[PDB]
Design a protein around this ligand. Structure first.
Ligand SMILES: CCCCCC/C=C/CCCCCCCC(=O)O
Ligand SMILES: CCCCCC/C=C/CCCCCCCC(=O)O
Ligand SMILES: CCCCCC/C=C\CCCCCCCC(=O)O
Ligand SMILES: CCCCCC/C=C\CCCCCCCC(=O)O
Ligand SMILES: CCCCCC/C=C\CCCCCCCC(=O)O
Ligand SMILES: CCCCCC/C=C\CCCCCCCC(=O)O
Length: 583
């Protein structure tokens, strides 16, 4: 385990995973190296690994992984020419060498975008050589996201393999494969967006706020565990997290493996759902535990009223160790409510906290905080009702028209955002509607919280980069607890001057009869935004009526003999017919 580390890892992970992970790891530091150069390093390091597996005492096998990895990079011939100052790391010794190498990874590496090829090209190369196809895939993706946690990249790659194997043997290949690739693309973006997000909030809001989140989530996850067990897990998760944000793969991997191992030895104190996850090999344990469903809540748990409102010792128990007492409050409220979004429980803890700070300093504290549960009622119900209305609207409209409803709604709130971004955000929220509303009330709020925090990151990313609105900046730099409530609170922009009418913007051709669904939808949806941008006062009945005539327009000219001129001529009509109705 400790003697030769390379040999322990090769035995722990097996040859295939080790190769994959070594490929990923080199691809994450050496981003501008060609695949064939990467394949060659991996084969060298893999053969060197095997000598150590035969003999822990063979030469250099006793070296550390950081030493060996660093050494290997320093051999890359074009290290100075390609990577510039990254070469200068090789002058240092192996505490500092490793750290210097980690500094020079490049988040924005400036490579061209990866164009998903055609299904038949893909399925052919997959059949032609699975390993080359997949590991080239893997390299191309890893080198554009050098901070993406390597084993989680390997688990996505395994599901890439599975999708190709099922779909390249099917009748309608593209109908099978394309929707799997969209699923996998979005998870990977979400999982990368959610990694990037939780690290920044650690650095911006501190270790206390993060521990508050962890207590919430772990208690919902493990409601049968004692507070003391939950709190231990919060301390060790907080460290695992702190260290993975720093970004040293092996450091991250050891911490997580240690937490997974401790959890697997203490199941009885934590959950009865981990039996399977804990029998899995090291590579997969922590990931598996991370995604396990909530444990069943204990029967007939009592009111929080006794310990947190009615007790005469509330202020005393609070004042002697505040954060613990709030931790206990957050624990008991959260284990009773796997139906709340984590950030809703954090509102409630903060509301409680604020009332205890006020009332324990007051003339009569017991009278003062007697009704603190009344303050919770409206904060609980605000998201419940908003989920209900939006999922009702989605049931009557379907995904596509629900997106238009949203597209209109948010164009009116923030007309300054560019039209392509309004289209992407709308569409994306439509999918959140489509997934999360298929759950019953019990699970709607957790689903939305994890999907919206992805979509709302993408948005603040785009808006940090190209700002247009103070109000959008406000919500994007608030607490992560008020982020969504902030965006929800945005009113319709009443300063906005209607956009100048442009003719080409509402000029259509027969190319829309020929496009795919998505593309046709995006081009329709782009036009509805620009329409709302020119006629922002347009009512729901006026907008629907413009859409209905347009629903006829496209369907007339798309099937009525030799057709590009209707588009030109029956187009002139609709524009003017609309301009009269809206003006
Ligand atoms: C000499 C070069 C060294 C190359 C090896 C690099 C990485 C190998 C191991 C990767 C991480 C495995 C642990 C996963 C566990 C966890 O996430 O819970
Ligand atoms: C950059 C502009 C786009 C803004 C997108 C904001 C989406 C946030 C999630 C839900 C907000 C809706 C709640 C308010 C009331 C409502 O209209 O139902
Ligand atoms: C062999 C070459 C591999 C190319 C990878 C193609 C798939 C792209 C994945 C991302 C996407 O779905 O848009
Ligand atoms: C003993 C275990 C740890 C205790 C954790 C602290 C208790 C909760 C503190 C009050 C609520 C804070 C919510 C998030 C803060 C934020 O908005 O940035
Ligand atoms: C568009 C379909 C579903 C929309 C859901 C309705 C409004 C928000 C749901 C409540 C979630 C609580 C807050 C979590 C988000 C966060 O602060 O990042
Ligand atoms: C200014 C005048 C422009 C007139 C054209 C209106 C464009 C709106 C597009 C609406 C798309 C609706 C699609 C549908 O429901 O199938």
């Amino acid at each position: 385990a400790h003697k030769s580390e390379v040999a322990h890892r090769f035995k722990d992970l097996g040859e295939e995973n080790f190769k994959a992970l070594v490929l990923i790891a080199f691809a994450q530091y050496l981003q501008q190296c060609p695949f064939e150069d990467h394949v060659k390093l991996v084969n060298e390091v893999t053969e060197f690994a095997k000598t150590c597996v035969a003999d822990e005492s063979a030469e250099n096998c006793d070296k550390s992984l950081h030493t060996l990895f660093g050494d290997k990079l320093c051999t890359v011939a074009t290290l100075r020419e390609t990577y510039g100052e990254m070469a200068d790391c090789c002058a240092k010794q192996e505490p500092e060498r490793n750290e210097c190498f980690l500094q020079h990874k490049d988040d924005n590496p400036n490579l061209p975008r990866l164009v998903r090829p055609e299904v038949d090209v893909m399925c052919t190369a997959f059949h032609d050589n699975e390993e080359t196809f997949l590991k080239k895939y893997l390299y191309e993706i890893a080198r554009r996201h050098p901070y993406f946690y390597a084993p989680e990249l390997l688990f996505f790659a395994k599901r890439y393999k599975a999708a190709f194997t099922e779909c390249c043997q099917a009748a309608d290949k593209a109908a099978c494969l394309l929707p799997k690739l969209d699923e996998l693309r979005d998870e990977g973006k979400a999982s990368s967006a959610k990694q990037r997000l939780k690290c920044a909030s650690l650095q911006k809001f501190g270790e206390r706020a993060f521990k508050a989140w962890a207590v919430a989530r772990l208690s919902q996850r493990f409601p049968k565990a004692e507070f003391a067990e939950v709190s231990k897990l919060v301390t060790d998760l907080t460290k695992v997290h702190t260290e993975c944000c720093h970004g040293d793969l092996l450091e991250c991997a050891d911490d997580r493996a240690d937490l997974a191992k401790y959890i697997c030895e203490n199941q009885d104190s934590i959950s009865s759902k981990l039996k399977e996850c804990c029998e899995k090999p090291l590579l997969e344990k922590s990931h598996c535990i991370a995604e396990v469903e909530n444990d069943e809540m204990p029967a007939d748990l009592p009111s929080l009223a006794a310990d947190f409102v009615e007790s005469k010792d509330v202020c005393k128990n609070y004042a002697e160790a505040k954060d613990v007492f709030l931790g206990m409050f957050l624990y008991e409220y959260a284990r009773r409510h796997p139906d709340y979004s984590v950030v809703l429980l954090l509102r409630l803890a903060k509301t409680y906290e604020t009332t205890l700070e006020k009332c324990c300093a007051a003339a009569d504290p017991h009278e003062c905080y007697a009704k603190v549960f009344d303050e919770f009622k409206p904060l609980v119900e605000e998201p419940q009702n908003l989920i209900k209305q939006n999922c009702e609207l989605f049931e009557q409209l379907g995904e596509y028209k629900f997106q238009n409803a949203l597209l209109v709604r948010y164009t009116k709130k923030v007309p300054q955002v560019s039209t392509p971004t309004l289209v992407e955000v709308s569409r994306n929220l439509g999918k959140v509607g489509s997934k999360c509303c298929k759950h019953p009330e019990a699970k709607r709020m957790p689903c939305a919280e994890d999907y919206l925090s992805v979509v709302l990151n993408q948005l603040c990313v785009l808006h940090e980069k190209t700002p247009v609105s103070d109000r959008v900046t406000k919500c994007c730099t608030e607490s992560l607890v008020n982020r969504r409530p902030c965006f929800s609170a945005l009113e319709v922009d009443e300063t906005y001057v209607p956009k100048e009418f442009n003719a080409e913007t509402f000029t259509f051709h027969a190319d829309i009869c020929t496009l795919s669904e998505k593309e046709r939808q995006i081009k329709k949806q782009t036009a509805l935004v620009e329409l709302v941008k020119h006629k922002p006062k347009a009512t729901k009945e006026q907008l629907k009526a413009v859409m209905d005539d347009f629903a006829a327009f496209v369907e007339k000219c798309c099937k009525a003999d030799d057709k590009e001129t209707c588009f030109a001529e029956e187009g002139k009509k609709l524009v003017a017919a609309s301009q009269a109705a809206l003006g």
